[PDB]
């Protein structure tokens, strides 16, 4: 069969889903096509980068993305990482399979709450491959 598709959005496509992303293509490899996007980007935040260096995962060449409506309705299974309330939380189109896993949002604080994000997020995506 061919590969499942993993959309992984969020307020923005530098630290949260980037991360996500990096753990998504290492953990869920061969079986599924991990993405990423935003409603904003910013770029790849420089501490994720880091953060994710020290697990030996390189995310430094993935892109900052804008969320595509094309590729929402078309995946398998589309994540919301944002916090419910903070500020630009992705607007979805119907019948979209879709779920919420929540995560702090790490800008501008030091690098130890990229760690503590990083592997929350880890943690996550290794439920989701054993479900
Ligand atoms: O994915 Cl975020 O850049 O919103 O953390
Ligand atoms: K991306």
Redesign the pocket.
């Known amino acids: 069969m061919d590969k499942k598709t993993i959309y ?1 959005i ?11 992303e990096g753990w998504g293509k290492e953990i869920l490899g061969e079986g599924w096509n991990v993405y ?1 996007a ?1 409603i ?1 980007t ?1 770029g790849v ?1 420089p501490k ?1 980068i880091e953060a994710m260096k020290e697990v030996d995962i390189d995310i430094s060449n993935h892109t900052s993305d804008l969320i595509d409506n094309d590729i929402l309705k078309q995946s398998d299974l589309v994540v919301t ?2 916090s419910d309330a903070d500020n630009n939380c992705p607007i979805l189109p119907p019948n979209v399979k879709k779920e919420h896993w929540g ?1 702090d ?3 501008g604080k030091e690098w130890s709450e990229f760690q503590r994000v990083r592997d929350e997020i880890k943690l996550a995506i290794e439920k989701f491959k054993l479900r």
Do not use: I, K, V, Y
Request: proline share 4%.
């Open positions: 992984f969020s307020t923005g496509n530098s630290a949260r889903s980037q991360m996500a990423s935003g904003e910013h935040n994720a990482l944002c995560f949002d790490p800008a």
